[PDB]
Amino acid sequence: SKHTTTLYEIIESELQRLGLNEFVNNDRIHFNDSKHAFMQKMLYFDDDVKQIVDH
Amino acid sequence: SKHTTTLYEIIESELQRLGLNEFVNNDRIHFNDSKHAFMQKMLYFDDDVKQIVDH
Amino acid sequence: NDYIGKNKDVGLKVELTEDIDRRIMEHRNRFRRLIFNRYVEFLPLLINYTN
Amino acid sequence: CDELAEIILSRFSLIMQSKFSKIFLSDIQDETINQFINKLYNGAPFIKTDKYIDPE
Amino acid sequence: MYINNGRINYNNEYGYRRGIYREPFYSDNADYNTNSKSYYDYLARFNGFIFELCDF
Amino acid sequence: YNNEYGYRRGIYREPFYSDNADYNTNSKSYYDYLARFNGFIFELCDF
Amino acid sequence: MYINNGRINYNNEYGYRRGIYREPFYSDNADYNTNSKSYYDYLARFNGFIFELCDF
Amino acid sequence: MYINNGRINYNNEYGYRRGIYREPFYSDNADYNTNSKSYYDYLARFNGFIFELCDF
């Protein structure tokens, strides 16, 4: 990301704008949650990521 | 592992997360169990190792 | 029998390639220091005075 | 001076153009290249790699 | 990084450095690419502020 | 033990047992992982 | 330091210090002049916060 | 071939070294690759501690 940007930052930006958050979730904080974490949400072909890619 | 980790290290770390122990087992200590050791388990491709790889 | 140094608990050593690379780097650094210092010593002796 | 100015324009353009570099071709984030450059720049009489880096 | 008697404590038995000296456990002769933020990320943050202002 | 009589810099390594470790680092590189850790430190303070 | 009035906050203060002379590239202390040492030493800034958080 | 009489005792009849000197039983003209832990393993241990903290 020294020049321009990567796809991951774009998708993370849109996911953050959607209102999702990595850590707190349902009143239990997880650093590497494996759900609601943006990575492991792009890899698992998740619906929100597909929506962002199409948009 | 001089630069980045090996597949064996990641699989071993996840197996240790699962709570398995290779030495003490069921109150009898074996240095090389050949049944519960992490090696001779990823070589036989146990169910745990397959779950770890698929995860 | 053959002679080797007394056993010193040092742990495992890196392979020969890493030894050679570090030796070459240390040789380069040593040469730089040597030549800089030698020029420092040589500098005051350049100009001399008659009588 | 018109003829001398044109020659200098060509002579200076050759100085700025004449810059050499070593270019490594690989995948865009293959961390082997960074390790390979680190060894090559420092002293490294012998470097061990796989067939897929293809130094030639 | 452990829990004993129901209370958590963090301690690194095998650390990279102790004092000024460096421990022998880990090897640090490896170069990793560091990818920071470019100008486009500055534009993106400014655009986010502009979006919030337009919403207000 | 670390007793040495001849000094060569950074060629000796010592094994150790890594009882636990977590390689599941949801990031594309170490830099972004450390950024995520800063964010998580703020979230943890709030929680 | 981090805990005030029964609440814990990080606050990540920044202090700017600029050395007089540039670091020696060819000194033997900086071996391979690689990247990994900074990555190893980055996490050491969180030790105080980790201890205070564990106590809290 | 007789039993150790129910008591285990460790002895090395054919060892590598005898005091300062070297025994002729084993060979030394062999070089083996030594693979230590990298920065990613330091990160893995720190992540293990963070995981335990999150569980707590």
Automatic annotation (TrEMBL), chain D:
Domain of life: Viruses
Protein known as: Upper collar protein
Shown segment, full-protein numbering: 169 to 224 of 335
TrEMBL record, chains E, G, H:
Protein name, UniProt field: Right handed beta helix domain-containing protein
Taxonomic source organism: Staphylococcus phage Andhra
Parent-protein residues present: 1 to 56 of 609
